[PDB]
Ligand binder design. Structure first.
Ligand code: HEM
Length: 145
């Protein structure tokens, strides 16, 4: 497991509560940053699907932070992990795409809540994001065999 503190969860929960006021705009900013860095990713999404996908990234990472605090591990149901993993595989999503998305997510948060930004805030989001991404792949691995 990992030790993910009440303070770390509160950073994620509290910044998301502030950013939620502008969730549609923030979702667009996230994808604008992703597509600025790696425009080739735009082809995967050839917009209401972009809106839903950005919201999934934010809300699913938030829920991963809550599960890390509560359980030391990500506890998403297997059908949800299996869906994300199969869809990502189908579309050719590889590690670099997750890495660019993480980078863009953290930049987006930093600009959305400059008054809360700090190394601790960055690391709390990043840890929750990384554990969700790893959890999808561990579920896809349980099914590769
Ligand atoms: C932790 C990070 C991510 C989470 C939580 C996440 C979540 C999701 C979910 C819930 C879906 C299903 C949408 C549906 O069934 O309609 C989905 C689909 C998809 N994801 Fe992700 N995703 C992540 C990362 C990525 C990344 C890094 C890429 C590529 C840069 C990507 C590209 C796609 C595409 C192309 C689809 C299918 C089209 C769409 O639903 O818009 N995803 N993702």
């Amino acid at each position: 497991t990992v030790i993910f503190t009440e303070e770390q969860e509160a950073l994620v929960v509290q910044s998301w509560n502030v950013m939620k006021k502008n969730s549609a705009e923030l979702g667009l900013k996230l994808f604008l940053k992703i597509f600025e860095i790696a425009p080739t990713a735009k082809k995967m999404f050839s917009n209401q699907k972009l809106k839903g996908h950005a919201m999934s990234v934010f809300v699913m990472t938030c829920k991963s932070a809550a599960q890390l605090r509560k359980a030391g591990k990500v506890t998403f149901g297997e059908s949800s992990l299996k869906h994300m993993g199969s869809v990502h595989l189908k579309y050719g999503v590889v590690d670099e795409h997750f890495e660019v998305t993480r980078f863009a997510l953290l930049e987006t948060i930093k600009e959305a809540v400059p008054e809360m930004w700090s190394p601790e805030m960055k690391n709390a989001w990043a840890e929750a994001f990384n554990h969700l991404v790893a959890a999808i792949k561990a579920e896809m691995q349980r099914l590769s065999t």
